[PDB]
């Protein structure tokens, strides 16, 4: 029972895991604050403008008539529908 | 008869002459030739990128002066190294660094004679530090659709070259073009001395200069009051009696740190006379 108090009493010192739980959570927080601000090269290509659709037609095409411009028929992306037009 | 993922161990002077050639290279596009040595199949090196006269007429294949080639290599032969050309550079300093309609001829016009003749696109007139602005490609041709367009041998070099894959007409130009890999050499033979002069010079030269001190503190403390009253216009806005404010909208900062390091500077400046004197 001599040394048989000391390891369990050093387990009493394990609020270091909780104060560092806040610290590791803050690591995650501000590290992905950083990584979230790192996304902003997405800014650096595309001022992808508002489009002017009269109506769509078949064969996976639409009618976009751009804002001071004319009729330009194109294909669609994958995350919106011909139904969504 | 076989294709491997190549690599370009650059001399930094290549990109240095490209940045001079683009900075001073007034946004009219211009043309030159690249000078390295074809070391092996899976790597190439560029040891040199030389200069051109002011060919302000148009980028074309005719703009290469062969007597300038002869005298250039001759003046490299009376200097120490008689190396070999590896290809050609050019500059696209205005637009978004993608293959012009003359390049689509002169690339294969040059690599009809040379082996690889890798194009180099530059735009240092983008912005100042954080873009990586260099662009190189390897012309694949319609002769080589016999076997597949997949060297692949060492992977993740073309996988991290594939990681951007982003220019409009160039990812349109997956056809005719697969890029080449550009790493920057273990340059400690120069990075050593660039670091050493960089930090032995970019702090007060002989570094006994600042060791201005106090009227800048007068103006700075008047800053540090004139903005502190609007700093304290925030805890009144923290009195929302119960809760009437969406998230903290935090303006604690930017006046901790300025006060902190500025008056660290002032207290170590108060040190500085008791330091220099004894």
């Amino acid at each position: 029972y001599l040394s048989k108090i000391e390891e369990l009493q050093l387990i009493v010192n394990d609020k270091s895991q909780n104060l560092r739980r806040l610290q590791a959570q803050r690591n995650e927080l501000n590290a992905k604050v950083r990584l979230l601000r790192e996304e902003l090269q997405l800014l650096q290509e595309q001022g992808s403008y508002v489009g002017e659709v009269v109506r769509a037609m078949d064969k996976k095409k639409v009618l976009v008539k751009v804002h001071p411009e004319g009729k330009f028929v194109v294909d669609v992306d994958k995350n919106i529908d011909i139904n969504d037009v | 008869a076989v294709d491997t993922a190549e690599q370009v161990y650059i001399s930094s002077l290549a990109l240095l002459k490209m940045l001079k050639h683009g900075r001073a290279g007034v946004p009219m596009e211009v043309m030159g030739l690249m000078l390295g040595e074809f070391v092996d199949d899976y790597t190439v090196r560029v040891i040199d990128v030389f200069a051109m006269p002011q060919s302000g007429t148009g980028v074309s294949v005719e703009a290469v002066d062969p007597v300038f080639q002869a005298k250039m290599l001759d003046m490299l032969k009376q200097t120490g190294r008689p190396e070999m050309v590896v290809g050609w550079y050019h500059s696209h300093p205005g637009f978004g660094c993608w293959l012009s309609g003359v390049d689509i001829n002169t690339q294969q016009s040059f690599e009809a004679l040379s082996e690889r003749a890798v194009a180099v696109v530059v735009d240092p007139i983008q912005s100042v530090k954080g873009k990586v602005v260099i662009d190189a490609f390897r012309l694949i041709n319609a002769n080589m659709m016999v076997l597949g367009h997949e060297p692949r041998q060492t992977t993740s070099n073309l996988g991290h070259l594939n990681k951007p894959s982003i220019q409009a007409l160039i990812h349109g130009l997956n056809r005719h073009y697969y890029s080449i890999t550009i790493n920057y050499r273990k340059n400690e033979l120069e990075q050593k001395m660039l670091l050493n002069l960089h930090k032995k010079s970019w702090m007060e030269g002989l570094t006994l200069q600042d060791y201005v001190v106090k009227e800048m503190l007068e103006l700075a403390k008047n800053y540090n009051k004139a903005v502190e009253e609007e700093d304290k216009m925030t805890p009144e806005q923290l009195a929302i009696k119960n809760v009437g404010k969406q998230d903290p909208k935090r303006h604690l900062e930017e006046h901790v740190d300025v006060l902190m390091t500025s008056n660290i500077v002032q207290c170590l400046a108060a040190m500085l006379d008791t330091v220099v004197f004894k």
């Binding site: - | 040190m271 330091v275 220099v276 004894k278």
Partner: protein, 93 residues
């Protein structure tokens, strides 16, 4: 004398300079015209104050024994540099 009391009294001046009290003022205003020493001479105590001067030509024995100022400076500003850095040692960081 390297030492202080650089607000010297006029007494050594009027003794060894063969000058009088009414002429120490001319003795140093003519030196203001000369321009090698520009003292802020006291005139409530009549003290001839020492400011910056043009020192000598050669003191070869003090070119050798300037160590008590030069090496003094070197090792003592070095030691006190080591002491400032040694008290702020482990914020090397």
């Amino acid at each position: 004398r390297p030492a202080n009391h650089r607000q010297l009294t006029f007494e050594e001046i009027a003794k060894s300079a063969k000058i009088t009290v009414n002429e120490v003022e001319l003795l140093v205003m003519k030196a203001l015209s000369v321009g090698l020493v520009k003292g802020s001479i006291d005139e409530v105590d009549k003290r001839v104050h020492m400011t910056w001067v043009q020192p000598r030509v050669l003191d070869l024995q003090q070119i050798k024994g300037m160590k008590d100022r030069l090496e003094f400076w070197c090792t003592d500003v070095k030691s006190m540099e080591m002491l400032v850095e040694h008290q702020a040692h482990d914020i090397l960081t």
